[PDB]
Amino acid sequence: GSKAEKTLGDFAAEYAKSNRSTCKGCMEKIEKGQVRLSKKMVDPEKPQLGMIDRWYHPGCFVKNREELGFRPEYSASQLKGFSLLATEDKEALKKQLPGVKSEGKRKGDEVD
Ligand SMILES: [Zn+2]
């Protein structure tokens, strides 16, 4: 099967469908109807349950980005489903954690 271009295959973004998600970045519950992010990794406080989709707030996932293992080549523009958020949230995620384009992600010479 073909490789993905919208995600690096390690972290995700969506609106919070529920208050059942809790931010591991500060240990407070994530609010329904606003953005929530997660990373896939084995939980370091309970490794026995294996790789989980560990949830974080829009501020907190940037605060621990370097613990989560982000690099500029694959910032918030490489989260799952990021493109389906509102334009103001897509801008605000990049404004805190922006991705490098110099790899040739969009030159204006792809489909044009
Ligand atoms: Zn938080």
Short mmCIF file of C-alpha atoms and ligand atoms in Angstrom, two decimals:
data_model
loop_
_atom_site.label_atom_id
_atom_site.label_comp_id
_atom_site.label_asym_id
_atom_site.label_seq_id
_atom_site.Cartn_x
_atom_site.Cartn_y
_atom_site.Cartn_z
CA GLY A 1 0.00 0.00 0.00
CA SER A 2 1.03 3.65 -0.69
CA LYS A 3 2.60 5.95 2.00
CA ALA A 4 0.61 8.82 3.60
CA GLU A 5 1.29 12.56 2.91
CA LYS A 6 -1.18 14.22 5.41
CA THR A 7 0.35 12.53 8.53
CA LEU A 8 3.82 11.23 9.60
CA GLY A 9 1.92 8.17 11.08
CA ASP A 10 2.39 8.93 14.84
CA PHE A 11 0.05 11.78 16.04
CA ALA A 12 -3.57 12.94 15.39
CA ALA A 13 -5.94 15.97 15.62
CA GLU A 14 -9.79 16.25 15.89
CA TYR A 15 -12.63 18.11 17.64
CA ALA A 16 -13.35 16.64 21.09
CA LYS A 17 -16.52 14.51 20.50
CA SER A 18 -16.53 13.78 24.29
CA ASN A 19 -15.24 15.02 27.71
CA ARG A 20 -13.90 11.39 28.16
CA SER A 21 -10.47 12.44 26.78
CA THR A 22 -8.03 13.83 29.40
CA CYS A 23 -4.84 15.80 28.71
CA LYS A 24 -1.70 13.88 29.76
CA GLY A 25 0.18 17.20 29.20
CA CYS A 26 -1.30 18.82 32.38
CA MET A 27 -3.71 16.17 33.92
CA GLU A 28 -7.01 18.04 33.32
CA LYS A 29 -10.03 16.83 31.27
CA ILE A 30 -10.30 17.96 27.63
CA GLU A 31 -13.40 20.08 26.86
CA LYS A 32 -16.07 18.84 24.39
CA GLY A 33 -16.57 20.78 21.10
CA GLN A 34 -12.97 22.21 20.87
CA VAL A 35 -9.69 20.74 19.40
CA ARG A 36 -7.90 17.69 20.94
CA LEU A 37 -4.56 16.15 19.83
CA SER A 38 -2.94 12.74 20.56
CA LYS A 39 0.31 10.75 20.03
CA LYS A 40 0.65 6.96 19.56
CA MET A 41 3.19 5.60 22.11
CA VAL A 42 3.51 3.04 24.95
CA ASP A 43 2.40 4.80 28.18
CA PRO A 44 5.57 5.35 30.34
CA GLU A 45 3.51 5.36 33.61
CA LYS A 46 1.75 2.03 32.65
CA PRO A 47 3.73 0.22 29.86
CA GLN A 48 1.63 -2.99 30.45
CA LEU A 49 -1.32 -1.59 28.33
CA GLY A 50 1.05 -0.92 25.34
CA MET A 51 0.87 1.79 22.64
CA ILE A 52 -2.03 4.22 23.27
CA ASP A 53 -3.48 7.29 21.56
CA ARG A 54 -2.45 9.56 24.51
CA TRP A 55 -4.51 12.83 24.50
CA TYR A 56 -3.32 16.47 25.00
CA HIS A 57 -4.71 20.09 24.79
CA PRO A 58 -3.81 22.49 21.85
CA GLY A 59 -1.45 24.38 24.24
CA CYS A 60 -0.02 21.36 26.09
CA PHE A 61 0.89 19.16 23.08
CA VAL A 62 3.16 22.09 21.95
CA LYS A 63 4.53 22.42 25.57
CA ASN A 64 5.67 18.72 25.53
CA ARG A 65 6.36 18.55 21.69
CA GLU A 66 10.05 17.81 22.46
CA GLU A 67 9.06 15.00 24.91
CA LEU A 68 6.55 13.73 22.24
CA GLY A 69 9.44 13.84 19.64
CA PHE A 70 8.27 16.54 17.14
CA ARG A 71 10.74 18.02 14.57
CA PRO A 72 10.16 21.05 12.21
CA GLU A 73 10.02 18.72 9.12
CA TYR A 74 6.73 17.20 10.51
CA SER A 75 4.97 19.72 12.86
CA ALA A 76 1.14 20.25 13.27
CA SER A 77 0.68 19.98 9.42
CA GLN A 78 1.49 16.22 9.85
CA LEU A 79 -1.31 15.43 12.41
CA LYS A 80 -4.15 13.05 11.24
CA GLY A 81 -7.35 14.86 10.18
CA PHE A 82 -5.79 18.37 10.70
CA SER A 83 -7.25 19.52 7.32
CA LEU A 84 -10.88 18.87 8.52
CA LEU A 85 -10.60 21.42 11.42
CA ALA A 86 -11.80 25.05 11.04
CA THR A 87 -9.37 27.47 9.26
CA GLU A 88 -8.85 29.48 12.51
CA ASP A 89 -7.77 26.27 14.37
CA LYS A 90 -5.57 25.08 11.42
CA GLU A 91 -3.82 28.49 11.54
CA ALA A 92 -3.59 28.50 15.40
CA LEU A 93 -1.98 24.99 15.54
CA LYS A 94 0.67 26.05 12.92
CA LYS A 95 1.14 29.47 14.66
CA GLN A 96 2.35 27.58 17.79
CA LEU A 97 4.02 24.57 15.98
CA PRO A 98 4.59 25.23 12.18
CA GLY A 99 5.90 22.69 9.60
CA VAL A 100 8.75 23.17 7.09
CA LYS A 101 7.76 23.38 3.40
CA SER A 102 11.33 23.33 1.88
CA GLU A 103 11.08 19.49 1.49
CA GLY A 104 8.74 20.29 -1.50
CA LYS A 105 5.34 19.74 0.28
CA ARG A 106 3.69 22.39 -1.98
CA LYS A 107 5.95 24.32 -4.46
CA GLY A 108 2.89 25.34 -6.54
CA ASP A 109 4.17 22.73 -9.08
CA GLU A 110 2.42 19.47 -8.01
CA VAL A 111 -0.93 19.38 -9.96
CA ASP A 112 -0.76 22.80 -11.67
ZN ZN B 1 -3.60 20.31 29.13
#
